[PDB]
Ligand binder design. Sequence first.
Ligand SMILES: Cc1nc2c(=O)[nH]c(N)nc2o1
Length: 267
Amino acid sequence: IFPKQYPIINFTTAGATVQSYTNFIRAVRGRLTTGADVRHEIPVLPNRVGLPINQRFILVELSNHAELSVTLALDVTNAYVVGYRAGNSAYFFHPDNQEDAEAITHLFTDVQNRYTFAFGGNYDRLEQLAGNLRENIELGNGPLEEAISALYYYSTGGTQLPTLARSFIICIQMISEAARFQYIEGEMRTRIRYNRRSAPDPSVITLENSWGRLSTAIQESNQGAFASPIQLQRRNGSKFSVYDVSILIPIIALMVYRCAPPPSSQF
Ligand SMILES: Cc1nc2c(=O)[nH]c(N)nc2o1
């Protein structure tokens, strides 16, 4: 068979319970990073520069209430959704470079049908197709169920790219972004409990737009002190400035590898 299969984590849009989602995200997090290499207490993702293909991706099996199954391919280096497998058909986003395309040539290799989009799943482009911004795309267990279904039905015919793109944006935020920020995870949990389905408010949006930035600052921050104030956005849109790692402790969960580690302070 394929030289070792990447670890898969299951999640179903059936028993909508807060803890099931918490366990889901928790598993994904621990599945991505080994736990070592933490810049100022915050965990760091493996550097792609020396990360072998056999340690490049993670899979997430999404079961729908109507017994549907889709498997997304997450990139360990930054929880990037590269594609998915709808049964025996696979779809991947247009890679940004050679190495990535070469790396992509490993996911769902046993598929009878394999395809690659002309566009990229990156928010900026994905939103164009969806014809709606993230602030107009609702999140929650409800929208998630719909999303998973849409991905599954792409291969049949009833696809509609706008809907397809929107479906991806949902899965991305609820799975990937939720793992990146404990804060976002909480937002989804709040929704699920009260069976609430709503669009991500300013605070959530900004964090997504600042993941890499924060990762850079947190790593280059001497003794935790941020070299320059990073203006984040509050729930009502009003901007507030962050000055230290301390504030981000309960917020950010995972950081992308930026620079070389310090004198291996993790022990
Ligand atoms: C976390 C994450 N953000 C994105 C994005 O914007 N696009 C794609 N394709 N995958 C992602 O994964």
